[PDB]
């Protein structure tokens, strides 16, 4: 093998099937672990009288002769952890009076003979974890009074009887975690003095064991993954030296008001899900706590003495309770993190966080805090994170928050004022309820959750001077030419054919669209470079609602009147219906009105952007409304197209030809202008392709009101009917 000068051989992994020969008799550590040895013959170690450490782990060992290990009076460590022994080699390990460590971990041991571990008068560590043991070997373990470490972890043990570990007086560590233990008698842990660690993690425990009372030296207790529901008072009466108590993942309802009490050395208390608890624990004597967590409970108050004692408290988590009032945190000089989210706290007083130095993280989200005192955070020391999201706030103080690195206020929709950026000089992250409140910080560089972008303009509403002049020209042309067309058409008020009526009504709808465009232009002019100060007010007030109603009404009324005009042209081409068409026009106007008013009864429609347009900017909100409007307009345009195609196909009407071509031009231009609006409305809801919001805003501002100015100029320039009507108006005025 790999013989070494220091008398420590390493035969591991050589594949041999016996004890190697030709080795020095002065060796003191032999490793024959990985090679496959299936048995140990008699006097297999007669050439190693000076062994002090024998490793046989990982062989396919299945039989050890009773005299195989005879003569190893100097053996101190024996490893057999990963072999195929089905039992404790009771006869083989006899006569090993100097053994101190014995490993039997992964052997499929199912039976422990009653005379096992006899003569092992120096044994101190025993491994029996990953076998298949159904009972604790009481009598075999009674032969090991010097044992100091013991593990029975992965066995199939279901219960522990009384006095199981009576003679284990020197035992220090006991592992029993991954057994299916469900029954612990009151005297099972009797005689277990000097025991410091007890592991009962993954057992099927039902109630809290009372056998712990006989463990005065216990320092660490683990029972976390059991099904324990109630921890009674005086549960740890007999364990004054406990430092760690693992109890998470137990389905817990009640913990008792004095379960944790007079535990001087306990450093962390974490309880979650204890719903039936409604009183803050009595922790007198437990003054060395550094972390306290009581998440899921019905606690309504915090004792004023929480900081008078618990001088070393660092982290406080009282989140998912229902706490109404906050006590004075005077004291708690070591407290760093406070988590009070998801409670029901309605106000923050001036002295709520009085003193309280070294407070770095403070969480107050999901509460009902409608009032924060101006100097509430004034006395705080170095504070980094502040979270007051979803708290129903109208004002936010700024004193003492210059050192913040992260602020969160996302859910306070009543907080409409603008945060001054001269206070949060060290700010690096921010969340605000509205995208216009992050204007004062722009882009050290701060990152703000609701992006300013292009559909929440910070300085100029319309944008560049090019778009501004385009929209101004569109507004003026639409207004003046629509007024001209309306006045000329309705000046005679004597003969009103269906085509004349439809032209006039389309002009009226275009005039309303021009009024909406003028609203936008005047708002952009008045808020020139300061639209941050106007955005919240405009989007939350009635102005955006009025503008959105005007825009939607104008567009839908134009579409419906155009469809009615196409139907009328088809009817006239095929072959006394003026009353019917008047009623149809009234119905179309009513439908446009109800479609425009529907977003008012809906919520979140007209506040998507300062353009007050519901569908173009928004894709995820109001998806049904956007889809319905887009599909309705597309179906109307398809009907117009098929009607025009049929009319052209079947018809070969000198007076009617002018109206036919005018309506064809109207439907052509309106459909051409509408299709990009629908495309851009559907664009942002698809993640495959990205389209710049700036181009979206510009194309919407240009094409949405474009028909309202293109139609009247077409009618004025290219209609002999308009020419003769203008002549009639001239005769009327003169």
């Amino acid at each position: 093998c790999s013989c070494d000068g220091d008398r420590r051989v390493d035969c591991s992994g050589k594949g041999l099937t016996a004890v190697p020969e030709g080795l020095s008799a002065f060796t003191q550590a032999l490793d024959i672990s990985m090679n496959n040895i299936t048995q140990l013959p008699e006097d297999a170690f007669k050439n190693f009288p000076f062994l002090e450490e024998l490793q046989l782990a990982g062989n396919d060992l299945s039989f050890i002769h009773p005299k195989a290990l005879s003569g190893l009076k100097e053996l101190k460590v024996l490893t057999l952890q990963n072999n195929q022994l089905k039992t404790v080699p009771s006869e083989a390990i006899r006569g090993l009076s100097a053994l101190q460590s014995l490993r039997l971990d992964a052997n499929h041991i199912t039976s422990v003979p009653e005379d096992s571990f006899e003569g092992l008068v120096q044994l101190r560590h025993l491994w029996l974890d990953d076998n298949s043991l159904t009972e604790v070997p009481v009598h075999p373990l009674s032969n090991l009074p010097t044992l100091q470490a013991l593990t029975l972890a992965l066995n199939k043990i279901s219960s522990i009887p009384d006095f199981a570990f009576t003679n284990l007086s020197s035992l220090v560590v006991l592992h029993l975690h991954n057994n299916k233990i469900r029954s612990l008698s009151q005297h099972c842990f009797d005689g277990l003095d000097n025991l410091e660690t007890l592991d009962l993690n993954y057992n099927n425990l039902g109630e809290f064991p009372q056998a712990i009372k006989a463990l005065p030296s216990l320092k660490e207790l683990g029972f976390h993954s059991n099904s324990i529901s109630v921890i009674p008072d005086g549960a740890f009466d007999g364990n004054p030296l406990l430092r760690t108590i693992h109890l998470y993942d137990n389905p817990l309802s009640f913990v008792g008001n004095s379960a944790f009490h007079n535990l001087s050395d306990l450093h962390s208390l974490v309880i979650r899900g204890a719903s039936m608890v409604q009183q803050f624990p009595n922790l007198t004597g437990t003054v060395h706590l550094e972390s306290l967590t009581l998440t899921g409970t019905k606690i309504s108050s915090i004792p004023n003495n929480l900081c008078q004692e618990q001088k070393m408290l660092r982290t406080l988590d009282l989140s998912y309770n229902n706490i109404r009032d906050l006590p004075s945190f005077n004291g708690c000089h070591a407290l760093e993190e406070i988590s009070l989210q998801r409670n029901q706290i309605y106000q923050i007083k001036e002295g709520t966080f009085q003193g309280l130095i070294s407070l770095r993280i403070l969480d107050l989200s999901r509460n009902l805090i409608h009032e924060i005192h101006s100097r509430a955070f004034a006395t705080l020391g170095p504070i980094t994170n502040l979270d007051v999201s979803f708290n129903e706030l109208t004002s936010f103080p700024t004193e003492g928050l210059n050192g913040l690195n992260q602020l969160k206020l996302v859910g306070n929709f009543k907080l409409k004022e603008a945060l001054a950026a001269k206070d949060f000089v060290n700010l690096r992250s921010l969340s605000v309820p509205y995208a216009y409140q992050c204007c004062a910080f722009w882009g050290i560089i701060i990152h703000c959750t609701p992006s300013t972008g292009a559909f929440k303009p910070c300085e100029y509403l319309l944008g560049s001077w090019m778009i501004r002049l385009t929209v101004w020209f569109i507004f003026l042309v639409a207004l003046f030419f629509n007024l001209l067309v309306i006045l000329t058409t309705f000046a005679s008020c004597t003969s009103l054919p269906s085509s004349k009526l439809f032209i006039g009504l389309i002009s009226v709808s275009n005039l309303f669209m021009g009024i909406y465009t003028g609203i936008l232009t005047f708002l952009d002019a008045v808020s020139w470079g300061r639209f941050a100060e106007f955005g919240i007010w405009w989007e939350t007030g009635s102005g955006c609602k009025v503008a959105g109603f005007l825009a939607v009404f104008s567009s839908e009324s134009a579409i419906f009147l155009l469809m009615l005009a196409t139907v009328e042209r088809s009817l006239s081409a095929k072959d006394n219906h003026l009353k019917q068409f008047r009623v149809a026009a009234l119905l179309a106007f009513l439908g446009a009105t109800v479609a425009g008013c529907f977003p008012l009864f809906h919520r979140g429609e007209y506040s998507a952007s300062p353009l007050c347009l519901p569908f173009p900017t928004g894709e995820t909100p109001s998806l049904g409304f956007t889809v319905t409007l887009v599909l309705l307009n597309s179906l109307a345009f398809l009907l117009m197209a098929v009607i025009y195609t049929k009319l052209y196909c079947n018809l070969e009407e000198n007076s009617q030809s002018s109206m036919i071509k005018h309506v064809a031009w109207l439907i052509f231009t309106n459909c051409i202008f509408f299709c990009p609006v629908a495309f851009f409305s559907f664009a942002p809801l698809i993640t495959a392709i990205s389209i710049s919001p700036e181009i979206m805003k510009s194309v919407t501002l240009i094409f949405f009101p474009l028909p309202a100015c293109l139609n009247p100029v077409l009618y004025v320039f290219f209609n002999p009917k308009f020419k003769e009507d203008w002549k009639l108006l001239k005769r009327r005025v003169t």
Partner: nanobody
Amino acid sequence: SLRLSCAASGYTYSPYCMGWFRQAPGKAREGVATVDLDGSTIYADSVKGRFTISQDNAKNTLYLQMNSLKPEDTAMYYCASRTRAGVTCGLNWAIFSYWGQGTQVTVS
């Protein structure tokens, strides 16, 4: 139909918890028939009825009678003894203190 005979010519007295074991090449030694000093006998599941164990202290021998040797009965057979007391008798190889040489039993 074989008859295995085991002789104990060295132990002074008190033949306690004798038994028979069979082994396949490279596998564990599985008990087949164990006799207590009071005459109580414990057999394996695949052994009872077919085999029989008889300890005679007049000649101080141990007999294993084998009947209807199925083809999966070929192995190496050992006899084990335990002069000392203090354990419940059974088919566990770990409790016995003395072992025999063993004979190769093949179906024939």
